[PDB]
Amino acid sequence: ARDADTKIWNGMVGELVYGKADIAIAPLTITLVREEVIDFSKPFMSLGI
Amino acid sequence: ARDADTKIWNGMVGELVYGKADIAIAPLTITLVREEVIDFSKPFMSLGI
Amino acid sequence: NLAVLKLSEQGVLDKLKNKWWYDKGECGAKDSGSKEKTSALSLSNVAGV
Ligand SMILES: NS(=O)(=O)c1cc2c(cc1Cl)N[C@H]([C@H]1C[C@H]3C=C[C@@H]1C3)NS2(=O)=O
Ligand SMILES: NS(=O)(=O)c1cc2c(cc1Cl)N[C@H]([C@H]1C[C@H]3C=C[C@@H]1C3)NS2(=O)=O
């Protein structure tokens, strides 16, 4: 997730935002705040809380 | 759908391909071959046969 | 974007989901929920009488 006041995305997000990692096939959830920095394909498996 | 042997899209997908329409808010199923001519957003409602 | 739809079209996602969730039905109720035992009446059933 992003840092407060510095927008530092840690975790697997910053690996793709900051040019570290190239692709992420992983259990990652499409949100609203994640489309602005990376891109998702069509979803492949549905779920819920 | 496309026609046999001519690849002529009738219906609504042809209305998007042939410049007649602008957007299609409709109960439309994301298939494979519909991706190659137009663009879909993320799915909003899930179903099955 | 074109590859995930191929997998969804050909059911490869279904096959993988069956392999990694349903072929490893291990614990208890999934396997033993459709069996039958006859009876043996114990005193803990009939005490209020
Ligand atoms: N039954 S499931 O959760 O494992 C599952 C879930 C989904 C699958 C395929 C499977 Cl097997 N493909 C769909 C895609 C197919 C087409 C329609 C939406 C997407 C495009 N996304 S999905 O709805 O997320
Ligand atoms: N339960 S449902 O079919 O009506 C349905 C189905 C979908 C919804 C919302 C609902 Cl209510 N939004 C999802 C999107 C929301 C976010 C999370 C996945 C996608 C992004 N697409 S979906 O999986 O197609």
Resolution (A): 4.4
C3 touching B, CB under 8 A?
A: no
User: What single-letter DSSP state applies at residue B42?
Assistant: -
Q: How was this structure determined?
A: cryo-EM
Torsion of CA A16, A17, A19, A22, to 10 degrees: 20
Task: Kindly report the protein residue whose alpha carbon is nearest to atom 13 of ligand 2.
Answer: B44
- Nearby residues of A41 by Cβ (< 8 Å), 6 or more positions away: C1, C4
Strand partners, B2: B9
- For A32, nearest residue in chain B (alpha carbons): B42
- Residue keyed to tokens 């072929």: C23
Count CB neighbours of C24 within 10 A. 9
Helix (H) or strand (E) run with residue B11 in it: helix B11-17
- Residue keyed to tokens 């496309």: B2
- Dihedral of CA B38/B43/B46/C3: which sign? positive
The CA B26 to ligand 1 mean position distance, Å, reads 19
- For B31, nearest residue in chain A (alpha carbons): A42
**Coil, strand or helix at A3:** coil
Kindly list the distances between the CA atom of residue A4 and the CA atoms of A1, A13, B8, in Å, as whole numbers in the listed order.
9, 15, 53
Other chains touching B, judged by 3 or more CB pairs under 8 Å: A, C
| Residues A13, A38 contacting (CB under 8 angstroms) | yes
| Residues A33, A2 contacting (CB under 8 angstroms) | yes
B35·C9 Cβ contact <8 A: no
- Nearby residues of A30 by Cβ (< 8 Å), 6 or more positions away: A40, A43, B42
Strand partners, B9: B2
**DSSP string of A4-49, one letter each residue:** TTT----HHHHHHHTT--S---SS----SSSTTTS---S-------
- Nearby residues of A21 by Cβ (< 8 Å), 6 or more positions away: A12, A15
